[PDB]
Every structure is written in C-alpha cells, then in structure tokens.
Symmetry: C4
Subunit: 219 residues, 4 copies
Amino acid sequence: MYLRITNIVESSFFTKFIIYLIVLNGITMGLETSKTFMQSFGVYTTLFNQIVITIFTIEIILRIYVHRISFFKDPWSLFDFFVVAISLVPTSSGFEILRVLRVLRLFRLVTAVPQMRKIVSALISVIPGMLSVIALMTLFFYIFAIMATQLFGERFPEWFGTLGESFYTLFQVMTLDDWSDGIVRPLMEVYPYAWVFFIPFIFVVTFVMINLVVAICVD
Amino acid sequence: MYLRITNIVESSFFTKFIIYLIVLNGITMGLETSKTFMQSFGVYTTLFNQIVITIFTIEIILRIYVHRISFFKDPWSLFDFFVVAISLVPTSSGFEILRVLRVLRLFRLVTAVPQMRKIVSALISVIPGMLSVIALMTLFFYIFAIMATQLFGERFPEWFGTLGESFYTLFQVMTLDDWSDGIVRPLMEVYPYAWVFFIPFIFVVTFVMINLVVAICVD
Amino acid sequence: MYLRITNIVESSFFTKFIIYLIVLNGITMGLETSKTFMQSFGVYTTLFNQIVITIFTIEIILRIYVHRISFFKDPWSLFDFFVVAISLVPTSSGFEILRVLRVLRLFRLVTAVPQMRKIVSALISVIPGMLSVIALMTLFFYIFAIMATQLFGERFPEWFGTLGESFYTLFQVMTLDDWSDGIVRPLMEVYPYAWVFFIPFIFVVTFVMINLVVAICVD
Amino acid sequence: MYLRITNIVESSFFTKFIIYLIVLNGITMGLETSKTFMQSFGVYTTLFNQIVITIFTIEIILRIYVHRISFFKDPWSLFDFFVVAISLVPTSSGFEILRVLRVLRLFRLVTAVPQMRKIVSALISVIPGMLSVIALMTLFFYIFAIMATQLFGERFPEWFGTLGESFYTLFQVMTLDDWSDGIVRPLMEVYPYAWVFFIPFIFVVTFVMINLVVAICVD
Ligand SMILES: [Mn+2]
C-alpha cells in the first residue's frame, strides 16, 4: 500500500487540491474578519475551518510515510508541520495568540507553490552574507542601549528607562522615525548635549546600512 | 479617400498639432484652478475645452480608420481612447470624479511624444520581473492585516478595526511613517508586546524592499 | 603690461591668496552670526568684509583682462562673477535677501579649489541623464496637483487650496514626511476614498524614484 | 623572561581568555541596568568589574612589552589602550560621562575577535573615498546654516537662533524627519517663501546623498 499512497501524495492532483483549499481557507479567513459575516455564516465557516484542519493533518501524516526522515530535513516541510501543529492546539486554554497564529497557515501557499519557494529561497539565501554585519550592529545597539538607559532613563523612563525600552527607542531613531521632534529635542531641553549621542548614532547606523545594501548588491 | 487621410493622420503636422493642443489644454487646466481666473475668463476656457475635446475625438476617429485593429492592440492608442472617452462623459450625473479625471488627458503628452514613450516603457518593463516579489508581499500584507485586525481592532478600531484599515495602517508602517509615536507606542500602552508584531513586520518588509531594489539593479 | 598681469593672475601665489581670503571670510561670516561677537568686533568685520569684496572685484577684473571672451564661457568664472556681483549690491534698498545671498561667495572655495570642482562636476554631469525622468515626474506632479486642488482644496485649503499648495503637499507626501497622520488620515475623515488618490501617487513616485537611482547606478 | 611572556601573550589560551571576560563583562553591564539586580547583587558586580579592569591593564601592559613601538602603531591596540584608559579614571570627579563611556570596552569584542575586525575594516576603508563628498556637504551645510540663522533665527530661535541650532535643524531636514509639518509649514506662516530655501536644500542634499551611495556601490 506504500506505493499506492506514494502515488496519491506525489500526484499532481493531490498538490493542486491542497493549493485549492489554501486559497479557499485564505478567502475564508478574511471573511471571519467581518463581524457582519460571522453573524450570518459563522457556523458555515467554523466547521469548514475545522474540516480543512483535518485534511491538512491527514496530508501531513501521509507526506511523512512517503518521506519518513527526508521530511524532517526539509525546511518547507518542517514549516507546514509546525504551522499545522499550531492550528491543532484546541480553540482554548493557554494563550489566545495561538488562535490568532492559525492564520500563519496561509504561508503554505508559499510552501506549496513553486516560484514562491524560488523567491523566498532567493531572499533567504542573502541572509548568511549579512550575519557578520547583523552581529556587528547588534553589538552596537546593545552598547548604545546600555549608555542611553544610564544617561537618560531617570528623567526619561518612557523612552530609555529600561534596557529594552532604550533598545526600542534606538530602533525608532534608526528608522529615523520622529527621532528629532519626538525624542531628541525633548531630551535636549534637559540634556543639551544629547545631540552628541544621537547624531553619531545616526551616522554610524545609516552608514552601516548603506554598506549592507551595497554588499547585497554585490553577492 | 483612405490614403488621403492616412497621409493627413501620419503627417508630421498632424502629430505636432496634437502636441500643441495638449500643452495648450494643460496650460488651460492650471488656470481653471484659479477662482479668480474663472470669474473673468471661465467662459473662454469652457468653450476652448469643449473644442479641444471634439478635435481629439475627430483625431481618435481618424486614427482608427488609418489603423483599424492595429490600433486596439496599441497600448498607447488604447490609453488615448479611454482617456478621451472619460472626457466625453457629460459634465453631470454618476460621479464628479469623471469631471476631475478629465485632467488625465494631459498624459497624452507622454503618449504623443517619444523619449517619454521610451522612458515610460523603460520603467514599465521593469515591472514583470517584480511580480513574483509583489505577490509575495501582498500575501504577507494580507496575512498580517488579518492578524492585526483580530489582535488590535477591538481597542484600536480606527487603525485596525476593519481588514481595510489594517491594510492602510500596515502600509503606513511600511513607509515607516510615524509608525512608532503614531501607532505602536499607543498600541503598547494596552498591548505591551505589540512590538513583537511590528518590529518583525518592519524587518521583513524592509528586507524584501531592499532585495527588490537590488533585483532591479541587476535586470 | 598684459603678460605682466597674466603672470600675476596665473601665479600659484595669487590663486592661493584667494583661497586664503575665502576661508577667512567664511570664518568671519560664522562669527557675524553671534549677536555677542558683533557687539564687540562688529566694526572690525564690517570693514574686513568690504575690503575682501574689493579685492575680489579687483581679481575678477584682472581675471577678465587675462581671459576676455574665454572667461564668459567658463561655468566657474561666470559663477564667481555673479556671486561677487550679488555682494556688490549696496547694503540697502530692494530685497534683503541680497544681504543674505552674500554668503554664497563661500562657494568660491568650490570654484577656486580643484578636486571640489572635480566632485561638483562629477555630480552635475549625472543630471543630463536624468532629465527624461525629471520631465516625466514634473508632468505627473502637475497633473495630480491639479486633481488634488480640485478634489480637496475646498475643505482643505491649507493643504490643497491652491495649485502651489497642492504642489507643496504632494512634495511632502513624496518625501513620505508625515504623510498619513499628517495629511491623508485627516483627508479621509471627510473623503473616505482619498487613499485611492494617495496610495497610487505614492507607488508611482517611489517606483520612479527607485528607477532613477538605479540609472545613476549604471551610467 | 621576555620570550616566556611573549609566549604567554601570543597564546591561543590568552586571547580566548580575554574574549571570555568581555562577553562576561558585557553580560554584567546589561544587568547593572537593573535597579533590581543592583539591590540584590550590586556588590558582586562592582568588584567583578574592578577585577576585570585590573586584568585588562595587565594584558595591555603585557601586550606592550611584547610589541613596544609596533603596538602604538596598531589601530586596534591603540583603541584598547584608550578604552581601558577611560575605564581607569576613578569612579569619581570631573565629568560622569566617564563612568558611562566605560561601556565602550565592549567594543573590544570587535577588536579581539577577527572577522569583526575584517568587517569593521571593510566598512572603515570605504570612508577615504567619501571625504571629497563629505567635505562638499559640510561646506554646504555651513553655508545654509548661516543663511538660515540670519533668515529665520529672530522669529524662530529654537530652530535657527544659533549657528549650531541651525546646523541641527538642517540635519533634521536632511534626514527628512518631520521637516514639513514640524519646521517649514510653521516657518511659512511668517515667511511665505521659506519653501524656496528648503525644497532646494532638500533636492541638493538628497541628490548628493544618492551619488555617495552609488560611488560606494562601485568602489
Ligand atoms: Mn517621518
């Protein structure tokens, strides 16, 4: 029966059937957004949902027999396992993000349709050549985050009061988002020289990011 | 009479006469902006306007005899047909965007003048090689837009209340426009962890956009 | 006497004596900023200023005998001429931008010193390759500025009330500066669909802008 | 005894030992952030801290016997000396930024670990090729900063009242941060034409900046 199901799983129809359900379940998840729709077809959709969830475990179960160890060494497959897994935790208990993290299954359209995998893989592949920079930056943030917490956190605890707060604020400055009228001009009403901390922070961080982009535009 | 008009239409004079009317109508539309001007010469320019609109239908009518089916397979010609057609719909009924959309005809200066045509075409040609990325993104947006509506839309309905609103807000975050003091700092007063939703969203979307720019700097 | 002065003019000393005066007049113009400094040594630097202004006209006169027609076909010389001409208009009458435009003579440090000229020339030379795009954009801005004035200027006359106002706001939207919470979210409280005007405007303008950068990265 | 210690210093175990203390001290400084941790184990931490500072001077002392002049001609060694030196100034007196600048020793992780050195070096090396542009820009900022101080500083002293203030505001405009609703629209309520100063400022500075990115993307 192995080759029987190995012929079911590997079949064009099987895959296209899965893809058909995803786009349907995707359409169905945008409708569960509407408080109106839920009042008229909420039941239609809750069951349709639980149904598709089974079909997917069945598939994932099947795909495993047909592949065994080869499966748990496939990025894309591991993904669909964990994603379907999330959607299996009963609609209750623990955290309610789990109910919300269900919509992660629509990323299966990326997993199950080639070309996406190409582009996603294309994208991801660039990351290894960025790890040296990403490490460098995280050290830098961490250092400045520590300096800021202890230079500005007493008077400005919303923004710099905690190591993590400072991390966040520094991120915002780095995205150059309201950094001046939002953060630094206020700071300077108390700490006139704060511009000496933030202009150098901005130059470095922006410089680094240009280099990183240029590097990607080489490799 | 065909070759007679085919020699009228294809003539340098004809083409240059059209270009002359556009820059004239374009000048005339900027003046229709002034409430002052309209109170003095509004009559002049309403008639001048209907005149140019006739001339353009005549031209578009002529151009169709001279080209027949070759014409309704020309992007640039199709454009002008539609753009002129909009300007034909009476100054009444339906909506008023149709009165306003009339100004789209000044895009004929792009259509009726090469180099422009070249440049526009140069640009557009870059699009097909982005469609794989654009699909990826629109999937990503759609996924997060749904998550956001159901995680933040109850307490923050102006921003995430509806799927469409989440889309808009997510767009704004993507343009990195007032994203922190504007959206996420507020969100965190109620949902401390919202940063776990928006920082990842920012990284991915910015990464992807950098890739897409680099892709265009290859092809 | 011609070659006598042609030998003074072309002397390394002469050109270096000029460069020496620029850096002094530049140093001296930053000090004129201080309300304090002016109360002490104001009279010192008003004369020192007028002194240098003479010297530069003497030079520019000298530079003209030595070069004649050749001089008025030199960008850098024409510049130097107009920038000194501005500085001769009597500290009085007309507009007082003329008093302020005097600080443009510090751009003579760009003229008088090579490498700067190289770099400036390097930059400027990239402009002609951009004029097709720049033309395209200005047409596009013009078209939308008109739609916006007539779509939003009645209710929102600060931002769209006038063609020029619309230009400015559109520019601001193009720099992506406070565009959502600043302009469009307001606009939508009255005109729900305004997003249909601004999201497309944003795509096109950012797309084009990316293209333009990449072109400057292949030429 | 020289070669004995030259064999100690150059030892793999030595270098790794140093790298070990940095990650330990770096972890330690993040905990010194916690007002909680300090009440608990503050004592534990200040001694462990002084200990490390001892160890590091010994190393730098040792490192010097083993390299003499060669050491004070090594960028990375100079850094480590100057960094440990900052951390040597007693926990008292003068400026308290000195207590804060201590955390700069975590940059020794860049210094003591290669690949980092590589990447930093990679980055830093791009700078020389940018000094013509950086010069061009600084002259530009200086010139406009002066015009702005004298054009707007009387009515707008927070933003333009002083040369340094103007420098700051101009930088903020250059980062395109809140530049319109934050600075120029205000400005225009009094000085209708201020758009004539800031749009050109914005064009030039953004133009130059794009060039500088491309220059890097070639060299
Ligand atoms: Mn902004």
